Design a protein around this ligand. Structure first.
Ligand code: GTP
Ligand code: GTP
Ligand code: ILE
Ligand code: ILE
Lengths: 253, 252
């Protein structure tokens, strides 16, 4: 299989996945496919963001890592001292991705470590392990590109998290300020007489219980929908749901 | 210079660049450097998002494209018809990135076209041109890496633009529904009359209508202005719309 074919298999995933975000679980599968490796994609603190494992599944310690969704803290710290691609690491080296207590299985194994960088900083690590053959230039071309793309994706996720929490705050503030005082009260009555932050609403039944007009209730919900703090499909009954769960607390302030 | 070394140039750019967005002029320059090519990165409609040219800078036709920030419509359409990487296109093929009126100068030229896909959609095209040497599979690995990351970046930007347009739409609707009944009728008569985007308002005239007063007009106008929908100043009062997708919307 040509390097060009291997890169195309990875790029096809990157170009055609659904949603805005690449799923690193998928990336791990594809990297494993084109390099015939055991693959970990881990965060800075060792959370397993994706894995694609074969021979490593034999090891009971590895099985436990998958359950905990974390590599050991010791290995985590070791990876963070690797600041350059280091390849063809053997089983008696502490950077090996194989369990030393299963040395006999992995006597000829090779590990390569690819730091994941973005925004000029270390965002995680991509680790590849083979039971037999050495890694070559093709493997490093694939791995370093993959690590770069994973870094881009983490950087995007991190920025979009920061942006979203800033823009949520503003949207909630705009929403709240667009309600009349009566409407603020109606919303309080609506979510009190709902099982929390969402559920099925019968406006008439709530209006009659708290002694207000359905019109005010309908108006307030319409305002919140257009503001985008709640979703609500209008089928007897109306399901409503708060998107920004910082809303109700802010509303009472 | 190994292929690994060449791919590291792009990797380093992506890992180290400042700001959230990757700059496509930077990408074009980096690709140009490692493959010794003339490089265009263009949108679906042929807008030049980034370029790095050498020999093609000598063509007055190309210069005009750069000034216009667009490749020609005809070439744009031809690029969109290319659905997968097509390499080593010669000077007599309409897909050449070279000016065919300079056929002798570019007689041995080679062009490779890299569709840019992201989010399962065609988002643009990466085009490389060499005056002499054939493209090989290492060149294609480099071009297809660059095309994929450009695609990821366009996808990110388009998603931001969708969210911005949502926020803009919400701002207008919230402004409208901040208006009381009388305030809305005042505004509706004010802009219907305003003749369009500009005009001076004599509020007294609108205030002749039953249910509308001068203070109602002031209140209605201030809500819209606070929202950033309009600007105002005092004879009478001069009104300037700043989001005429508010004139539209005010009617529904
Ligand atoms: N695009 C994408 N990003 C992911 C995926 N999984 C995790 N992330 C991002 O990767 C980063 C690290 O993941 P976290 O869940 O925060 O794990 P963590 O151990 O707290 O990360 P650190 O702060 O680096 O220690 C975060 O920015 C996540 O949003 C994924 O499948 N796809
Ligand atoms: N990250 C990044 N995005 C860019 C850059 N230049 C343009 N874009 C984005 O690329 C996309 C296409 O550019 P446009 O300005 O929309 O050009 P257009 O011809 O109207 O685009 P089409 O919708 O394809 O017709 C937009 O999402 C831009 O925001 C760049 O240098 N870096
Ligand atoms: C993924 C962790 C690996 C197995 C490491 N060599 C350890 O023994 O902990
Ligand atoms: C960039 C466009 C190129 C030169 C195309 N072959 C043309 O003649 O228009």
């Amino acid at each position: 299989m040509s390097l060009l074919s291997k890169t195309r298999e990875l790029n096809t995933l990157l170009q055609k996945h659904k949603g805005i975000a690449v799923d690193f679980k998928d990336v791990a599968q594809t990297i494993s496919s084109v390099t015939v490796t055991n693959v970990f994609i881990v965060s800075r603190r060792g959370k397993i963001l994706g894995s694609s494992l074969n021979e490593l599944l034999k090891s009971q310690r590895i099985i436990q890592m998958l359950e905990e969704r974390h590599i050991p803290s010791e290995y985590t710290e070791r990876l963070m001292e690797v600041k350059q691609t280091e390849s063809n690491i053997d089983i008696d080296n502490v950077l090996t991705v194989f369990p030393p207590e299963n040395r006999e299985l992995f006597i000829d194994s090779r590990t390569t470590i690819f730091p994941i960088l973005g925004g000029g900083e270390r965002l995680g690590t991509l680790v590849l392990g083979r039971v037999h053959d050495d890694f070559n230039e093709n493997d490093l071309v694939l791995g370093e590109y993959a690590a770069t793309v994973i870094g881009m994706e983490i950087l995007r996720e991190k920025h979009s998290e920061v942006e979203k929490e800033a823009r949520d705050k503003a949207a909630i503030t705009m929403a709240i300020n667009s309600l009349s005082y009566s409407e603020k009260e109606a919303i309080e009555h609506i979510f009190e007489e709902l099982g929390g932050t969402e559920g099925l609403l019968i406006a008439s039944k709530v209006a009659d219980r708290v002694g207000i007009t359905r019109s005010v209730i309908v108006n307030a919900l319409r305002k919140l929908e257009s503001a985008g703090v709640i979703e609500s499909r209008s089928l007897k009954g109306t399901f409503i749901k708060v998107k920004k769960e910082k809303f109700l607390d802010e509303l009472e302030k």
